[PDB]
RNA sequence: UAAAUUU
RNA sequence: AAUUU
């Protein structure tokens, strides 16, 4: 039936100028050598992304879908949700949010300026009065950094982002913010991934795995998910929203947003031209995550049922899914996954790479990450979350006139502190740099470098400073990512770490704590690291 | 562009 | 601010 997009042929223009790397990268030329491999997806590539996602969708539902959908609405009705005052919605707008066409931006919205509030007041009136006129959207190319991969095509084309004007974004929030906070967890219970921290995620997977007599695991992702979402899916999304108890004023707003925005509309490029028309998810609306998550969950739970997956325990985050079940033998397990995938394909969520049963927790990747294992200070197995370092390292070497990557280093150091690639590579580089520019006591992204051991202890446990004997997969992948980017191998970082450590300790104070906890892996004279007041 | 998590 | 989808 429905084509995901149609195109006037106008270009998908850039929303500003897209910075180029420079002939010297002074922050990262010590980190890695292959700067030619680090690139930023650009709007020039936007039309290739368009070709890849423009396609025809035929959806065939069935008893299993209908059944799961039914049960999900009974869940929805145990939910009470309120409108949000125009003001409360204004103040949830992020500080840099793209300004409105109508001559005001996010400063004004967040400070409740009167031109902003009056405009928004009328946009909301118009949603209540008019329940069908399509609402124009702006289409744009996302700039993200990656390492080139000649195996999978060289350079990825840019993701397409599609969004309404600021005034509309606020009204979305008035109608739906409260729902986004309550509904997903109500519908999906323990399966809703975003509710968990990373360490809860790991614990959840291990409990799931442990409780099977004979576990089997797999993951699924949908190829161009936003494109695979149909009008009917979006309307089914509405009817799930409507199954809650809601002010009538909300229902009309939901219904109107659904029909005027969510199921489709005209798209304008950044220079004002009509660009095309859209009959799938616009990634950029408030309901993107919740919508994706819920809809993925319906299809997936139905597909599980269509396929005989026994005692499934799910984790869903957007279009990213993990299922851990009772193996029915591998011959059956293969047949059932073939079936799972056929069902998802009938429901219009076809796979990027078709899935595969696995019987070892390390081999299951989802949300670009997986669980691994190492040994802790007393010899006990310590399970933790990790990922291929390729992208984080690439992003670590993105330096331009506008952008510095030091924040990226820190963010990864915190999130992935127990991994061998953060400990040996990023930490060493990060500290090495700040020491030399003598900027340790400074505050990056509202964090102080000198607080890290505390921060990491709070978050990952003290075992993060004493883990050893990392896995073959993980050693191989790290080694291999450093070779791919022209970074020193691990033995060299061992050396640089000793040096950094020594210099940090001689500095004394917090510095020295940093040096003793964060780099104990680097010495043979391993210390007895004790818990930290802070 | 939106959300979640971490901070 | 970081990361993810
Ligand atoms: N930067 C982003 N902004 C908004 N939505 C996003 C973003 N990245 C991913 N998503 C949403 O989640 C969906 C699944 O993401 P992913 O599997 O990572 O890519 P794909 O679109 O190729 O399936 C996307 O289609 C999109 O709707
Ligand atoms: Cl231990
Ligand atoms: Mn996907
Ligand atoms: Mn309706
Ligand atoms: Mn995905």
């Amino acid at each position: 039936s429905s084509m995901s997009y149609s195109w006037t042929g106008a270009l998908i223009t850039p929303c500003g100028p897209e910075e180029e790397k420079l002939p010297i990268n002074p922050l990262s030329n010590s980190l890695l050598r292959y700067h030619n491999k680090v690139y930023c997806t650009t709007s020039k590539s936007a039309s290739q992304r368009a070709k890849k996602v423009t396609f025809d969708r035929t959806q065939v539902l069935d008893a299993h879908y209908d059944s799961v959908l039914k049960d999900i609405k009974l869940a929805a009705s145990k939910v009470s949700a309120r409108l949000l005052t125009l003001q409360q919605a204004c103040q949830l707008t992020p500080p840099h949010s793209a300004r409105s066409k109508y001559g005001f931006g996010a400063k004004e919205v967040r400070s409740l300026s009167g031109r902003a509030v009056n405009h928004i007041k009328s946009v909301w009136k118009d949603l209540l009065e008019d329940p069908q006129t399509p609402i124009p959207t702006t289409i744009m190319a996302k700039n993200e950094v990656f390492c080139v991969d000649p195996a999978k095509g060289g350079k990825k084309p840019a993701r397409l982002i599609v969004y309404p004007d600021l005034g509309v974004r606020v009204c979305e929030k008035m109608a739906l913010y409260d729902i986004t906070q309550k509904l997903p967890q109500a519908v999906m219970g323990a399966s809703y991934g975003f509710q968990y921290s990373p360490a809860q995620r790991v614990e959840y997977l291990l409990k799931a795995w442990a409780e099977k007599k004979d576990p089997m695991g797999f993951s699924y992702d949908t190829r161009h998910f936003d494109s695979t979402v149909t009008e009917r899916d979006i309307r089914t999304e509405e009817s799930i929203y409507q199954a809650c108890s809601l002010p009538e004023e909300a229902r009309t707003a939901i219904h109107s947003l659904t029909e005027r925005l969510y199921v489709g509309g005209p798209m304008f490029n950044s220079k004002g031209q009509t660009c095309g028309y859209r009959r799938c998810r616009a990634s950029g609306v408030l309901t993107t995550s919740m919508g994706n998550t819920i809809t993925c969950y319906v299809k997936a739970l139905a597909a599980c049922k269509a396929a005989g997956i026994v005692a499934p325990t799910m984790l869903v985050c957007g279009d990213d899914l993990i299922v851990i079940s009772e193996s029915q033998g591998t011959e059956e397990d293969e047949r059932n996954l073939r079936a799972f995938t056929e069902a998802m394909t009938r429901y219009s969520a076809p796979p990027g790479d078709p899935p595969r049963p696995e019987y070892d927790l390390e081999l299951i990747t989802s949300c670009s990450s997986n669980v691994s294992v190492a040994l802790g200070p007393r010899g006990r197995r310590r399970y933790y979350l990790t990922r291929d370092p390729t992208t984080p390292l690439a992003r670590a070497a993105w330096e331009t006139v506008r952008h510095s990557p030091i924040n990226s280093w820190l963010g990864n150091i915190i999130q992935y502190a127990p991994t061998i690639w953060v400990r040996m590579v990023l930490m060493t580089h990060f500290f090495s740099i700040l020491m030399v520019q003598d900027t340790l006591d400074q505050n990056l992204g509202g964090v102080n470098p000198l607080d890290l051991p505390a921060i990491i202890e709070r978050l990952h446990g003290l075992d993060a400073f004493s883990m050893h004997t990392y896995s073959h997969h993980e050693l191989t992948r790290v080694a291999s990512a450093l070779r791919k980017l022209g970074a020193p191998p691990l033995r060299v970082w061992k050396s640089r770490a000793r040096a950094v450590r020594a210099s940090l300790i001689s500095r004394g104070g917090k510095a020295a704590v940093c040096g003793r906890y964060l780099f104990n892996w680097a010495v043979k004279t391993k210390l007895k690291l004790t818990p930290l007041p802070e």
Side-chain angles (χ1 to χ4, degrees), chain A residues 1-18 20-43 45-50 53-69 71-73 75-77 79-106 108-114 116-124 126-151 153-206 208-212 214-270 272-330 332-352 354-377 379 381 383-401 403-440 443-457 459-493 495-523 527 529-533:
Chain A
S1 345
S2 30
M3 222 48 200
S4 66
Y5 301 86
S6 331
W7 306 92
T8 74
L11 289 175
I12 297 164
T13 45
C15 298
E18 296 149 326
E20 215 53 283
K21 257 158 100 59
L22 295 190
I24 301 184
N25 305 279
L27 300 169
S28 63
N29 56 13
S30 22
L31 182 60
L32 59 84
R33 288 183 27 232
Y34 300 162
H35 293 273
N36 55 312
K37 280 172 136 149
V38 176
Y39 71 101
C40 187
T41 63
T42 201
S43 72
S45 77
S47 36
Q48 287 162 86
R49 176 85 182 169
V53 302
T54 308
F55 81 98
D56 205 304
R57 284 138 333 131
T58 58
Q59 172 163 47
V60 178
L61 308 201
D62 56 63
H64 295 128
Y65 184 102
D66 300 321
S67 161
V68 164
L69 180 47
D71 294 301
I72 276 167
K73 291 171 167 170
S77 35
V79 161
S80 218
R82 61 164 202 97
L83 274 183
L84 226 71
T85 69
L86 173 150
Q87 299 96 326
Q88 303 167 309
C90 283
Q91 320 234 77
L92 295 165
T93 296
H96 288 334
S97 191
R99 68 182 298 95
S100 188
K101 268 202 286 123
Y102 304 84
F104 68 88
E108 295 88 335
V109 171
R110 287 155 71 69
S111 69
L112 301 176
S113 110
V117 167
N118 275 339
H119 181 281
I120 290 173
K121 227 129 72 174
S122 70
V123 169
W124 179 258
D126 180 299
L127 280 180
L128 291 187
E129 275 154 349
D130 180 352
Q132 77 125 72
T133 320
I135 302 177
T137 61
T138 309
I139 179 166
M140 89 180 182
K142 174 99 192 144
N143 307 129
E144 330 184 57
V145 165
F146 299 103
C147 177
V148 307
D149 174 17
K155 288 187 198 194
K156 298 179 186 199
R159 172 174 291 289
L160 295 172
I161 299 293
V162 168
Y163 68 100
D165 182 82
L166 177 46
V168 181
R169 307 204 287 282
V170 187
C171 296
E172 288 184 73
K173 292 189 177 91
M174 295 166 55
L176 287 148
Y177 190 84
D178 200 36
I179 279 155
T180 73
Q181 303 283 280
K182 252 165 280 185
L183 175 56
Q185 181 151 128
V187 165
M188 288 157 75
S191 297
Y192 177 71
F194 301 120
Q195 92 188 262
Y196 296 110
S197 47
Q200 288 171 303
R201 193 173 312 146
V202 172
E203 196 222 317
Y204 182 79
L205 288 169
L206 295 171
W209 196 269
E211 74 158 61
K212 306 317 179 200
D214 198 55
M216 184 277 279
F218 70 92
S219 70
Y220 198 90
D221 189 81
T222 295
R223 187 187 179 261
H224 309 322
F225 181 99
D226 61 2
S227 183
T228 80
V229 175
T230 63
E231 286 126 320
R232 179 168 171 179
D233 277 327
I234 293 151
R235 295 191 171 103
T236 301
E237 268 156 29
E238 189 208 318
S239 70
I240 302 176
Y241 306 154
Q242 304 289 8
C244 316
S245 58
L246 303 180
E248 223 68 14
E249 203 186 342
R251 308 194 176 280
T252 307
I254 310 322
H255 178 83
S256 188
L257 285 164
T258 297
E259 295 297 319
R260 301 182 58 184
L261 184 54
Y262 298 165
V263 305
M267 293 187 302
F268 292 83
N269 75 6
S270 74
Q273 294 119 305
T274 321
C275 201
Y277 198 98
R278 188 198 107 230
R279 291 184 220 74
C280 60
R281 170 85 75 231
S283 295
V285 304
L286 184 69
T287 41
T288 310
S289 305
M290 165 175 67
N292 285 359
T293 297
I294 284 172
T295 276
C296 172
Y297 175 75
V298 181
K299 290 175 190 189
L301 189 49
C304 281
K305 282 154 72 64
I309 301 294
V310 180
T313 302
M314 291 176 69
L315 203 90
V316 197
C317 291
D319 81 338
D320 277 82
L321 165 69
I322 284 185
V323 189
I324 289 156
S325 44
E326 289 290 1
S327 180
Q328 295 312 112
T330 76
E332 214 207 303
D333 292 345
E334 305 284 327
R335 194 159 43 252
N336 298 349
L337 252 69
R338 261 180 271 118
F340 179 93
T341 315
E342 283 167 277
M344 295 287 300
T345 297
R346 283 184 313 268
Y347 309 155
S348 195
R356 199 166 76 171
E358 294 297 1
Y359 306 82
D360 176 280
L361 194 57
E362 201 180 13
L363 305 185
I364 286 162
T365 295
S366 196
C367 297
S368 288
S369 71
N370 70 281
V371 183
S372 201
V373 67
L375 302 178
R381 302 284 182 297
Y383 295 92
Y384 67 101
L385 211 74
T386 185
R387 60 165 302 174
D388 191 293
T390 288
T391 300
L393 288 177
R395 277 164 196 184
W398 189 253
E399 314 181 42
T400 77
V401 157
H403 187 273
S404 161
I406 305 190
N407 294 144
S408 172
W409 309 343
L410 191 61
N412 277 311
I413 289 167
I414 288 161
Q415 184 168 18
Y416 289 111
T419 66
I420 194 184
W421 56 276
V422 163
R423 286 172 83 211
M424 298 189 50
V425 181
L426 277 174
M427 264 164 199
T428 310
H429 190 60
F430 178 81
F431 274 100
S432 166
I433 284 288
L434 298 172
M435 270 199 298
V436 167
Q437 63 188 46
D438 194 54
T439 53
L440 283 173
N443 265 60
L444 319 179
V447 164
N448 189 288
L450 288 170
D451 293 345
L452 278 169
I455 296 156
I456 281 159
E457 171 165 15
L459 175 61
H460 290 279
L462 195 82
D463 296 314
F465 305 128
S466 268
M467 264 150 71
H468 62 93
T469 302
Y470 284 86
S471 76
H472 176 75
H473 266 79
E474 190 62 7
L475 294 173
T476 328
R477 193 161 65 187
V478 169
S480 148
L482 295 165
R483 218 159 41 232
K484 187 162 73 228
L485 288 150
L490 287 173
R491 64 182 149 83
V492 169
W493 294 100
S495 304
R496 302 203 192 172
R498 286 202 203 75
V500 161
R501 184 177 183 267
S503 163
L504 260 173
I505 283 178
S506 45
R507 274 157 201 251
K510 285 181 120 192
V513 172
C514 270
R516 281 182 249 109
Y517 282 66
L518 305 188
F519 299 92
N520 220 240
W521 62 268
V523 306
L527 269 51
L529 303 171
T530 78
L532 290 169

